[PDB]
RNA sequence: GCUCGCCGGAAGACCAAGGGUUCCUGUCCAACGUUAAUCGGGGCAGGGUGAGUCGACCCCUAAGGCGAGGCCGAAAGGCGUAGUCGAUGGGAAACAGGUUAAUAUUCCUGUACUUGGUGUUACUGCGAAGGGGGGACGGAGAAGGCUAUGUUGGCCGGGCGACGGUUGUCCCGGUUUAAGCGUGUAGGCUGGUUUUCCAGGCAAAUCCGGAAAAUCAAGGCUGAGGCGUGAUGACGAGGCACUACGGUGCUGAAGCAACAAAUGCCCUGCUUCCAGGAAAAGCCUCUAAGCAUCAGGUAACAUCAAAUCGUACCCCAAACCGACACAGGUGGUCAGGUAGAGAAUACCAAGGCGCUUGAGAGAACUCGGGUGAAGGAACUAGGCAAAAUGGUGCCGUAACUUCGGGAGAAGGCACGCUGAUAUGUAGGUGAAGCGACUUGCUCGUGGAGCUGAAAUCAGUCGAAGAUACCAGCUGGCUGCAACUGUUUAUUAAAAACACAGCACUGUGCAAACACGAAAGUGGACGUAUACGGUGUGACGCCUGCCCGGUGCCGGAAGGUUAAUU
RNA sequence: AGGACCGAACCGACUAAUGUUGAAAAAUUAGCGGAUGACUUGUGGCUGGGGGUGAAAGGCCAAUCAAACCGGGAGAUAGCU
């Protein structure tokens, strides 16, 4: 089991964009910023618990930092089964 | 059989092949093979320690029984094989107990023949015996120097040794160089001469033929600059000096043997 | 024409990287020198 | 937007390496961009890289590195055993459609597949750091069987012609379909099955190796492609709407056959050759210590797990390497048509471009071309440069020679189109049918169709028929080096170097010799038909004389002679 | 069969012109040579300065070579300018 604290740490923010929206309304998938070391499993469990929704699968990609000073962050494609989240 | 190639092109005009119909045409016996990576003449420091080596065809080492230890078990010759690693060529022998090994192929040996090692084997080619048991005047090959060590002498293509005398624990051998050497009579030997005596009749015919034996070109000393070789420069072809190695030791006559540990065994230095 | 610098990250790290410097005392002295001078980029290792 | 030019085995597409956000979108025009710029790889802001199956990581190893102890060496350190790393190599598995402004074998849709764990049930000998198989291998060449792919017919949808003609031996487009699963064939290879026994594989084994005996030899492995299914699916020429004029939605006909086919596959095959062609793991089998109504194994079935990381973009280039948006360099993969032997070349297709200064004029002179009357090397250091020759078939061909050459020697001649032979021939491919059978991915026979040279004869055209591009100038006499090769990156490609061969000399193995204060290592896992050094330089005919000197080799009677005492 | 032959890719580099403040710190253009080999190329490795490596040219060793580069001795020394 992944304990409560890590779940409270792995979800940073919901990623909002045209891709993120269209993903929500077509694939029923939500896009999140997650802790850079979060795992498919950790994101899955955290979403299921903290959002009380049911998830099919998680796809993750690390977005490389843009010159400025942007830090590398991980983007998560969370595919819900049927619950409406937000 | 030595065969001349017809001169359909330069580089074939002078080739003389040594073709042997009895050599096995398949692959060798895989249980007696090891990888044998080339060196280029470099030692573990990475420096060339022997010049003119490198390139050449890839070769797998065949494990050859030089010791001939299985005493009293007769063995039959299965086939004769090309061996890239010797000038001689080898024979796969099967022992009646189910073991196979490679030996140097004696002169007349051929597939189906029976060989045997021991103290009681018969005096005939291919049989390995301690030199106590071999008649004086015999022609042997693959001779040992220290008992149980393995054959080291007379082991190239057409070579052999004559057991000249037996005086106590030592036999006097006429090595192929013309040297009389004493060796303990407990050292083993094989009757006969090493086969493939025609090996020396081949003519490579072209530079590439040498290159694919791994032999790289030799630049003459006198063709270099003075900083490169003692046979230095000159305007034109100049020599004017006593010939030497690249390291300045007089070649053409000067004698380099300096071993007093084994001088006791040299009955007569070659000539 | 072919110029002298033909980059290769593997070869770079093997030839001048941090652990290659640390392998021998002479490399560790290179590192000590570069710290003493205060180099921002201590080796090629990126 | 319409034309026109250019590339097209690339200047198209796709990657690796390298780079690093250049990607896509909106704004902007200071600087940057060799000009202007409203544009941009520029500035600024926002987005974009989704994986059990692709790669990395990972299991395993090569060259090599490092290396517990160890052996060495003033120290620092060197080498190296057990080991441990290290790909450029070997180890499990996904494909087709659709999608975004930018990601797709990753998303979605359809159809799959792999490897473990965990249960449950059945049935059981399981179990190594060990053994034996396997992995697992060269070069050349020659088929055959195929496929990608093309071409043509048929089919289906549309057309009826800006100018004579054009309801047809007309015109134009489409005619696509995968992993997987079933099947097992053109090939390729080996006989098989029991029984007994053992001087082998550390020991030992039922595995493998050997030796017998019997009985069948007709048994098994492997392998493209085809075919069926996947798939009543998807796609599809087109319409038909709507519209931001970008584009989006909706519907959808035919979807076959023949021939010609790769450098791709069968094939790591086969044949030949000498130069004799990795390694280890996964894998499969055997047991050992052990475990023993257990554990494990094996099969079915269910369940779960397959993390992490790379994924944008450029990538023969304005994103890499060259200070530059530099005429240079840069590994792999794919590669259509018509001519053509071709990946040459000409022109094109898909696709991509027109090279980030332009507008005039139409001087000398410069550069890069074209053409020249009469001459024809008179030029010049020298035919430098230019011009010339060029293809295929066939005829013909000298001295000389090491018999292979020389030799495309030299020199000729026939090339187009049309018609006939023969409404297309020789040949290739091959349906129906017809029989057979050990009856289907069958064999024989038979030939529809399809493709299709080369010739001969006759006729015709232009000045000319290898009509372009493309594509040998040739002969004679000599020097030198035999030759193919190699070199002064960036003024010398040679007669130099190398070479096969030849000789001389060292060298008995702990070899000589080299690199190392050493340990060691190469030589060499080689053994005098072997290795090193040296001179010459294929081959033919040959290599005379001289040992004074100087080296080297052998002797040392005698003289002399060091430390030492 | 062949260090066979002709000829693309590929690898070279004989000749001529141009360029010489270049498009380029050695290229371009027209020809040229080899093109199954003593070949060519990718990726890694290995050899180090009196040292390597060299089919040998004093060639090559990061546009540097009769002794690399970098830092130190070192403000070497300079009857010379």
Numbering used by the authors:
A (entry chain t): 1 to 86
B (entry chain c): 2 to 272
C (entry chain 6): 1 to 46
The authors write:
Co-translational folding is a fundamental process for the efficient biosynthesis of nascent polypeptides that emerge through the ribosome exit tunnel. To understand how this process is modulated by the shape and surface of the narrow tunnel, we have rationally engineered three exit tunnel protein loops (uL22, uL23 and uL24) of the 70S ribosome by CRISPR/Cas9 gene editing, and studied the co-translational folding of an immunoglobulin-like filamin domain (FLN5). Of these proteins, uL4, uL22, uL23 and uL24 all have extended loops (ranging from 10 to 25 residues in length) that protrude into the tunnel, and along with uL29, have surface-exposed globular regions that crown the perimeter of the exit tunnel.
Within the wider vestibule region, the uL23 and uL24 loops were shortened to lengths consistent with those present in eukaryotic ribosomes with 7 and 11-residue deletions made within the uL23 (23ΔL) and uL24 (24ΔL) loops, respectively. The 23ΔL24ΔL RNCs were resolved to an average resolution of 2.75 Å, where the truncated uL23 loop is observed at high-resolution (local resolution 3–4 Å at 3σ) relative to the uL24 (local resolution >4 Å, at 1.8σ), which is decidedly more dynamic. There were no other significant structural differences in these ribosomes relative to the WT 70S ribosome, suggesting that the loop modifications only altered the local environment surrounding the site of mutation. Following loop truncation, there is a clear increase in tunnel volume (calculated with POVME38) by 1272, 1736 and 3008 Å3 for 23ΔL, 24ΔL and 23ΔL24ΔL ribosomes, respectively.
